[PDB]
Design a binder for this molecule. Structure first.
Ligand SMILES: CCCCCCCCCCCCC/C=C\[C@H](O)[C@H](N)CO
Ligand SMILES: CCCCCCCCCCCCC/C=C\[C@H](O)[C@H](N)CO
Ligand SMILES: *C(=O)CCCCCCCCCCCCC
Ligand SMILES: *C(=O)CCCCCCCCCCCCC
Lengths: 283, 5, 268, 56, 60, 283, 60, 136, 268, 5
């Protein structure tokens, strides 16, 4: 029944003491933190406490859209030697660092995912030609479904994959997704492998990456400009924002202290000294 | 429902 | 208690095994959850589970290691450290799936004239960092899984530069808890400290923790045990003191699903 | 952040008497220190940290 | 199907309320209520088997 | 129970007088203003008063968006020697003068803040090139959070800072903010320092500005054009409008009579003569 | 959760009312009601310790 | 007029001697060693607002024919319940001649002004060693 | 108590200050009287008293002295030892009259291999003998009142023979309790013994004692604290052992009458 | 109809 926006406990007035009760003395070897409050070691006045922990609830701590990737696409002249660029991104929160670090204060999590898409475009060649307003197709390709090989091949039909057709210059696109994990929670850390190496099998055959579970965890987003080739080339970027709604988290962890180095917990030489010089008896 | 002032 | 009972004096009995201690600092139950069997409401594989009970839920003692002034720390993974322990290991390798909780009892006595403090941490999903700066996530199954001998921490990161035949092992730097986070914060994990003047053991009761009700014990370790000297060993005025550290661990409420022929892993 | 208007003051530790040891005993030792919040502690106005970055 | 909840009113100019109607079948589409619960830190701050009484010796 | 839109008191009819009652005679030394009404010194008729003070309530006096700053940004050609301009503004009502003067009729205030953003853009070079529609990012960076050094560095990820992605040519952007002060009211005036100079410390070390409290009072707004570099340069301006909603004020003050000169109460030589010539016996 | 209040009708063509529904959890997001109170000026116009009777001598 | 908000703690805080108002603004032009003091112009109430409006602040007038004293009871006023007394002043007392001193036909009259002030309901928090400020 | 409580382990909290101890020998309340404010039936000055409460009734630590094999003993006077302690000293020097009680906590730890015993005595009206045999009652105010540094006892009476410029100080001979009575009888005064094998502190709660309800704190000391080695310091086989002795004293229920300008005494 | 929290 205690809610996140409830006020914290009042300070009760306490006077002088002389007893066998020893709140100040403890033993951290036990694994416990001493539950003390100011009235245990100093004289206090009565204060009616109004402050609350509302903004540090798990939901409120995460209640923000974070950028997780930038996808690049274009629409060139038909005469180009290089193919029309469509983008392919393997969904993850580990390409950027900020949301990753926040989620990694915890070992496991459950949440509904809100994805918001901000789309910007520009001219590249110092031309004077124009381009009519672009429509973009953001196709979700779940693990197993055919990945596009060309900006215009059959897969963009999307009979079953979810697609967003976004019109340039309109409000940024947005969809929600349920908790889609194949486990009862998302694992931010997996201390294991996806294969057991057997003795009767070759080393190559039993091998797999440390800490990786499903190779294609959540599938792909594929993005294209739906408009046909245009004389003047336009390049666009799709910025993807992830917000974890309706979230639950388990098993707290110390936050990432040295720079991220890949999708695992690995660290690079030369980045291992976060702390700065400060003298023991200097304020 | 409805408040009325 | 007025009839002599103490926080410091405990007896633990599991199966045909008993541990006594006269210098404990209470004992810890991780996240306040005692180990339990998998409930029908949370169950997933439908076949009748194997539950070996006293045959596997008993205290197994691993190889004793040695604490010296140069020790940087030790680590073990569960269930890996127990993979060769009597009928627990057998039940593990014969089944696809398995889940288990543990009582971890770390032992280290000295004398009223020695000093030092070991932080004993139980970490869920204790993913450790690799030795390479050319490839991430490349620690081999064999090196990730030392069995009962465990591994150790180092004070220095030193990258494997042999690109022809890479070592493919962890390089766990102690002040970074071997995983890129600061050791001073490891206390948010279930822990006890063996501070020689106060106590000669640590006892951690660990529930099965995972994002699943049951999983591959052979592919995945649920818990990591990390022991690090928070305050170094010291004795009288000897330059080279040594005291032993012994781990005894008991599986608890372990059950297994998916029986077939025995798994024979490539461990070297 | 470091701010003079909202400064918190000074934590310090001193010898009240002295550390005394008998013979055959280490004459130097360590203390370890720990910090934690009390039940009346709270934070507000969510913000990005400076404790992680992604240059390039 | 309207949900009427109260606001915690910070700066002031009765209970002031606000209204919420869900427009979609899937709860995943819903906004966050922010009507969240708190819990005691004990599973992390006092994970010990024998209950700690802070005025008493932690070790006896 | 008396409301701001209630009619003011009726004039009551009053006749001739000859008594020891002396309403007209008073003594302003006491510090009081004589509470007189016309029927105290002249003969009056009965009037049913309909006028009200509704538009001069504190809320109604302030119920308007005031411009507090103009932020400049651009998006140049990629080939430019000069960096792409992103803007950084320390939030305040003291860069402009009008809302400042109104708030300064009072010493302290509490209010919820409504910020509205008007965004305009133009071409600068006498070119003939075009630019596709711009998206702007207005990031709130609270005191402590990393300030952007480049238009495109990691901080624009905003995992925890609030950001508005505004699309050009759409309705002006708007957000609300609660009373966010660290005190129980905003201080329009602080007669003090943020540091005590100690004798045992050097003068430099104990020094601080007169009347300034938290150096970074409310943080920063950082604004950028999210679109990549474009051959033709476009320059934009973001005009910020502040409206104080749900406002309370304490301790009235004489209004600012000479031109503002900085964020404090300082005045400049040559601006100190507001009043004009008018003869004592001239109407 | 609808709030129904009356308008003070100025120019005319019963009580005419208007409706308000709050759409957000945070009272900071709310519009201003303009349903404000007045007070007596006395704390500024008569801050004296002994109550002033205007027909009487201010000084006696 | 080269730097705003630059009055030093020492000059802002005269202690019991107080400070004075001037009829003339006169800018400190020594940029090498700036005076760093206030220059409070009387008709501008020393703060850029007109003195005739100072009556919206709690006040009394000592008009010699009527009275020989002023008594103001001041509550603690601040945007906080309690604060640093050493860093921050809550109230300012300003005494200005609204009508100049005059006597008989003397060219140089003088009469004294004495301030007596009593703290009321004062309470203090955060006890430590004594603050020793740099006041000169 | 069965919940761990001990006669030896105490916590004292006054104002913003706390003392802990794990090796006490209970604590003493002089003459069974806890400190109290002056009652209206016993009151004498009629002006509203000043009662500084937490601002002065808090633990003040005096300068630490050193116990060696040659130490003959130490003494302090109250309120004199506290005359320069924070707001207690200020309240004292601003008022004609003042009364106060005290918690006196003497601190001295060593090791299970050291030995020695300090008698800690609280004496009401602890009048000490002078250094002269030409003039009685001639110890100067300055020498009678050392402030926090206190004074010391001597094993030898040695008369000041400089008659031109007399020393005018005390010559307190230890076995005569510095006042002409035998030290073995000092135990009739409220006391504790710090015997190193048993305890590392002494705690004496002192009521205000006087032949008056209130008096001049600046002219008169109510209590004297005398610390004497009843059994000498000894350690292992060292010829020159040393252990520190620290005094921390808290005023209790202190009230002051007769406010004026501050007293500025001639102390040197 | 309406729920009320
Ligand atoms: C039209 C757009 C549809 C977008 C559909 C996205 C569906 C995929 C949701 C991905 C969920 C990612 C959750 C985050 C990562 C996991 O926590 C960890 N790597 C552990 O499993
Ligand atoms: C995405 C945009 C978010 C914008 C967030 C702005 C938060 C900061 C609110 C600033 C409040 C300024 C209040 C005015 C000034 C103060 O009255 C005085 N200087 C006294 O404290
Ligand atoms: C419960 O909702 C009954 C009351 C209905 C109130 C009006 C609903 C407003 C419009 C909702 C449209 C449907 C959303 C798909
Ligand atoms: C109280 O509000 C119950 C009556 C509901 C009336 C219709 C509400 C109209 C739509 C409000 C949508 C919710 C706003 C987030």
């Amino acid at each position: 029944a205690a809610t996140s926006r409830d006020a914290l406990p009042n300070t009760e007035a306490s006077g002088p003491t002389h007893s066998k009760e020893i709140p100040a003395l403890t033993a951290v070897e036990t694994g416990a933190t001493n539950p003390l409050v100011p009235s245990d070691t100093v004289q206090t006045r009565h204060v009616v406490q109004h402050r609350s922990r509302s903004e540090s609830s798990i939901e409120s701590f995460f209640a923000r859209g974070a950028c997780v990737t930038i996808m690049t696409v274009d629409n060139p002249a038909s005469t180009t030697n290089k193919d029309k660029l469509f983008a392919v991104w393997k969904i993850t929160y580990k390409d950027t660092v900020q949301l990753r670090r926040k989620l990694e204060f915890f070992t496991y999590s459950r949440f509904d995912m809100e994805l918001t898409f901000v789309v910007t475009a520009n001219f590249t060649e110092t031309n004077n030609g124009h381009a009519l307003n672009q429509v973009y197709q953001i196709m979700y390709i779940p693990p197993g479904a055919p990945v596009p090989e060309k900006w215009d091949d059959y897969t963009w039909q999307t009979s079953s994959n979810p697609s967003i057709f976004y019109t340039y210059g309109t409000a940024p696109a947005r969809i929600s997704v349920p908790y889609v994990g194949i486990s009862n929670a998302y694992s931010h850390f997996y201390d294991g492998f996806s294969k057991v190496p057997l003795k009767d099998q070759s080393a190559a055959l039993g091998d797999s990456l440390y800490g990786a579970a499903s190779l294609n965890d959540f599938g792909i987003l594929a993005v294209r400009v739906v408009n046909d080739h245009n004389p003047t080339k336009v390049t666009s970027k799709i910025r993807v924002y992830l917000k974890p709604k309706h979230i639950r988290v388990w098993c707290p962890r110390p936050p990432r202290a040295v720079a991220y180095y890949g999708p695992g917990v690995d660290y690079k030489d030369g980045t291992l000294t976060p702390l700065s010089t400060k003298d023991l008896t200097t304020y | 429902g409805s408040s009325s002032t | 208690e007025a009839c002599g009972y103490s926080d410091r004096v405990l007896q633990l009995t599991l199966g045909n095994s008993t541990i006594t201690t006269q210098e404990a600092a209470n004992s810890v139950v991780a996240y306040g959850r005692w180990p339990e069997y998998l409930r029908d409401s949370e169950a997933n594989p439908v076949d009748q589970p194997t539950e070996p009970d006293v045959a596997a839920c008993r205290f197994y003692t691993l190889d004793t290691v040695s604490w010296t002034k140069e020790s940087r720390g030790w680590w073990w993974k569960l269930p890996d450290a127990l993979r060769d322990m009597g009928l627990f290991g057998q039940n593990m390798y014969y089944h696809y799936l398995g889940r288990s909780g543990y009582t971890v009892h770390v032992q280290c006595n000295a004398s009223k004239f020695h000093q030092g403090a070991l932080g004993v941490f139980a970490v869920p999903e204790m993913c450790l960092a690799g030795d390479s700066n050319t490839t991430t996530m490349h620690t081999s199954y064999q090196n990730a899984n030392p069995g009962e001998k465990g591994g150790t921490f180092t004070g220095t990161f030193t990258p494997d530069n042999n690109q022809t035949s890479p070592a493919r092992r962890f390089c766990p730097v102690d002040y970074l808890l071997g995983n890129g986070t600061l050791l001073g914060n490891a206390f948010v994990f279930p822990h006890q400290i063996i501070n020689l003047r106060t106590n000669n053991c640590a006892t951690l009761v660990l529930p099965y923790v995972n994002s699943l009700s049951i999983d591959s014990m052979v592919k995945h370790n649920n818990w990591g045990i990390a022991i690090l000297p928070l305050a170094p060993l010291n004795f009288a005025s000897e330059s080279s003191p040594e005291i032993p550290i012994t781990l005894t661990i008991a599986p608890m409420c372990c059950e297994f699903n998916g029986l077939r022929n025995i798994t024979l892993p490539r461990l070297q | 952040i470091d701010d003079s208007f909202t400064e918190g003051g000074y934590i310090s530790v001193f010898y009240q008497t002295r550390i005394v040891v008998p013979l055959s005993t280490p004459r130097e030792m360590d203390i370890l220190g720990f910090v934690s919040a009390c039940n009346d502690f709270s934070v507000r106005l969510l913000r990005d940290t400076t404790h992680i970055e992604q240059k390039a | 199907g309207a949900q009427v909840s109260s606001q915690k009113v910070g700066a002031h100019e009765s209970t002031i309320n606000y209204t919420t109607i869900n427009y979609y079948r899937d709860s995943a589409s819903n906004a966050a209520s922010k009507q969240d619960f708190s819990q005691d830190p004990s599973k992390f701050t006092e994970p010990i088997k024998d209950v700690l009484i802070k005025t008493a010796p932690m070790l006896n």
